[PDB]
Design a protein around this nucleic acid. Sequence first.
RNA 1: CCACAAGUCGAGCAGGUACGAAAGUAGGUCUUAGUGAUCCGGUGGUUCUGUAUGGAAGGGCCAUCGCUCAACGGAUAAAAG
RNA 2: CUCAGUAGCGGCGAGCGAACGGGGAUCAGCCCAUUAAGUUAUGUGUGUUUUAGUGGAACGCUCUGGGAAGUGCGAACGUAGAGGGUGAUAUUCCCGUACACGAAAGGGCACACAUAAUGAUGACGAGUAGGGCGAGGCACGUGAAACCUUGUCUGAAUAUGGGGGGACCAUCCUCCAAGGCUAAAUACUCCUGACUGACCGAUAGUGAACCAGUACCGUGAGGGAAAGGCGAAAAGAACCCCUGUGAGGGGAGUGAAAUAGAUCCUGAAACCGCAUGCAUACAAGCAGUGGGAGCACCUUCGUGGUGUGACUGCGUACCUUUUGUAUAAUGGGUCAGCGACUUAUAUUCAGUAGCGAGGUUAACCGUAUAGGGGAGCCGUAGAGAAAUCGAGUCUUAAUAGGGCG
Lengths: 63, 117, 144, 200
Amino acid sequence: AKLKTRRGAAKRFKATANGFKRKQAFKRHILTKKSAKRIRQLRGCVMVHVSDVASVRRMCPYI
Amino acid sequence: ARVKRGVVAHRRHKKILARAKGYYGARSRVYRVAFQAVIKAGQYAYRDRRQKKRQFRALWIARINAGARQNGLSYSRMIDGLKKAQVIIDRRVLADIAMHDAVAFAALAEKAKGALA
Amino acid sequence: TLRLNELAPAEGAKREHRRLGRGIGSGVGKTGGRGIKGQKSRKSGGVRPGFEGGQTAIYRRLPKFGFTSQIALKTAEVRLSELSKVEGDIVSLETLKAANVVRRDQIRARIVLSGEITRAFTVQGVALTKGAKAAIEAAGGKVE
Amino acid sequence: MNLKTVSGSAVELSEVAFGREFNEALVHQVVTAYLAGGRQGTRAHKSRADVSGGGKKPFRQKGTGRARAGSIRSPIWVGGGKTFAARPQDWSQKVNRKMYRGAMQCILAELVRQDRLVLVEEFAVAAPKTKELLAKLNDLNAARALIVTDAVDENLYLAARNLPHVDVVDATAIDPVSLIAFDKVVMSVAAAKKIEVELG
RNA sequence: CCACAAGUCGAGCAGGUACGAAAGUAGGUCUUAGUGAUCCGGUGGUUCUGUAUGGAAGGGCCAUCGCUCAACGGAUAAAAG
RNA sequence: CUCAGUAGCGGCGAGCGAACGGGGAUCAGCCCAUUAAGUUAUGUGUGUUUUAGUGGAACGCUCUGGGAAGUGCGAACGUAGAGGGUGAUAUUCCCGUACACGAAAGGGCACACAUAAUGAUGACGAGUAGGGCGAGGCACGUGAAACCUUGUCUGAAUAUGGGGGGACCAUCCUCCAAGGCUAAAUACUCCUGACUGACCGAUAGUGAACCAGUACCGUGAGGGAAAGGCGAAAAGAACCCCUGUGAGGGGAGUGAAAUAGAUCCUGAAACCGCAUGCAUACAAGCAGUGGGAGCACCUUCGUGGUGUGACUGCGUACCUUUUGUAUAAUGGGUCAGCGACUUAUAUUCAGUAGCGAGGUUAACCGUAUAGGGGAGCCGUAGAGAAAUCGAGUCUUAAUAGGGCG
């Protein structure tokens, strides 16, 4: 039948003009011990690596 | 479109069995045994097409050695003398002359020995 | 010419399909391209997409973010060059839907400067960007 | 285009419908699609589940000296199921509207170029008698022919029914396979005009 | 530096500041160990959202809290012979 | 059919998965005590169909042949050149086919009428709506959880009234529960008739083409085979001979053919005989291969052909699995027949064809591969969690810097 999206991956990735964007890890908790530079540099979105792009494409066929 | 295999399969097995004519026992009667026997024969033929040249060159060299020793030289000295005298006749023709005409071989030996001197 | 036994496809249009396990000469005999043993050589041998052998997967070691807006599913975007499909000179949501540049379930539309137009249009109740409005007025049109 | 009827009069036919350059690949695709659409596709086989019996394990797994077996209806055994059993199929293909129209235009242009098309001012028979139609075609030199008419008369239909290599159709019922199969095509001027309006 | 996820160094620009007369120095400690992804929830803010409409509940974003998950890339919230 | 694998649900894992809106098929509403639409039986009258059937055109010579429908020459019918049979391949030989005609009697369907019944113990809906506790259903797993059902405990108002709009309140919009009946569009094939197939052709196709759910197996439920073909016509071999008045054969005869003679079309391979030619009883091994004398037959008389191979150089099968196999590691007694990368849907890439800033219809209608059907889908614009902006946008006090474009 129709291909089905992996909803867990759909909640983690979004599509840009030429690729996919994602959030950065290690910013959920245990934040007091982290330096200010890590705190502000782990904030925001980055791009999905070319090695994982193919897997993301198989997991999210319509985005 | 159902396809029956009988006619083509029979033709293939029959061609192999025909190439196996003359072999002993099951090697000319049984397809499994006969098929192995034909491949091995092909391999042997491939290798022996190279072995044949070596065998015949050895035979020519032996006959030339006999002629040279009848005329008072050895094979190596006769070959060296002919090479120094510029004669380019090959070993097959030299062996043919050695076997069939002793006088011409004696003349060739004289030429080689004169070149060596 | 022009007989049922004198017609052929263009060169390069058809290929033979790949038939596995039919002898040494074919090049895909015996194992049929699967290699030797292991899980992938079995029947239905692939592992699930996204499975990485046991370590935490890429889509589970990353965090979730955002929420989905409901009004965005009913907002529509219209290129300026698409206005040429409209019959007449009145540009509104109904006429855009009739021209089939907007889906029938959209409740509002936006016009962006993407192409060019030559006719003079009158726009009613459709949002315009600054560039689109400048182009519409420069071509001789107006809004309401 | 200007083409003459059988009696020397002139008719004006559009270039688009009767003068388009031949595209063999397009015509081949459309003809193959029609022949495929003609299939019926009714058949079936029984797999190892459909064959009668075979529910029990024939003998125990170990100790007997036999090769292990799980059912007497395995596709390896004589009398067992077919490994990949077929089901009824649909063989129709999609043909683009513009592709179908272009193929029909190419076919008509080629027929005009090869002179297997004969334009006739009027084509009718007085009685539903085979001999009358046969004589008309024999004087037209169209012994084997497809006759395309604007509206099919009962007498024409009945006269043509029994003739081998002779068929009669309406202007809107022509098909690419029948346009090619027959040796000549006899067309009335009204049928040609309607086909022109339909653009091949 | 590196398969990924991560990790490390950083001149310089803007704002507020401390110490110096001043040119200036300072984004923790001579350096390299002192650590734990995601999920689920708690707390403080917020010009985001709010299922007829006005609110609200709930959710989002920013900051932060709860694991000897030590078999330390962590199969379950929950398991011996 | 789309919306859409979207919004959501989910050890937020594996997975599960809507609705609104739009396009189609079919279209229909009627009643609660004097009672409606409708439906079912009964009988009558019209139309239609069905259960046997009748007529139904047109060819002769000549060659081969056991036999003509086949060869060569010349005719005829066709609203009939579908199919089957006839000693080989027939529109004119037979049965039929197109077409025309036909019912004592009997049945089916449709329409109208009449006589019953039924709809109909039912008259505006109270142990009901709502609530507490425990469960079930909703795409929705207790979740912020609306709505529906109820096992247990309770319990209203009654048109100045009541239910819903996904916790809850106000306002607006919409509807009237606790009483009923209702065709079509939809699902299926034990059956009966007609027709069809890029379905099988006796290890296939039903297990079963044949006296098959039989033989046989089991206490029983149950399991479950193998087995088609003389010839156009039996014309199926009178009579003689050997033999036990046997089996089996040899003559004679029939037949186009009897090596078509009864388990009889064709008659392959494994396997087993008889005859002829050559080699072979002093020599050690995957049995061949490269040379090579002699002998036998044929002969275009050879620097030819066919069969055999004294003597001699080299040479430890095949497959699989392995770092590595002659391996004393696996598998195969042999032959013949069968036996394993498929099908449907979705998606991505590459070829190729059409159209081209555009491309394309789905269901469906359709004397039906055509023609209609534009709902919908992909492309044409990004940034941001989002509201929002838009060739820009986000971040920020910042027009600086930087990220995606």
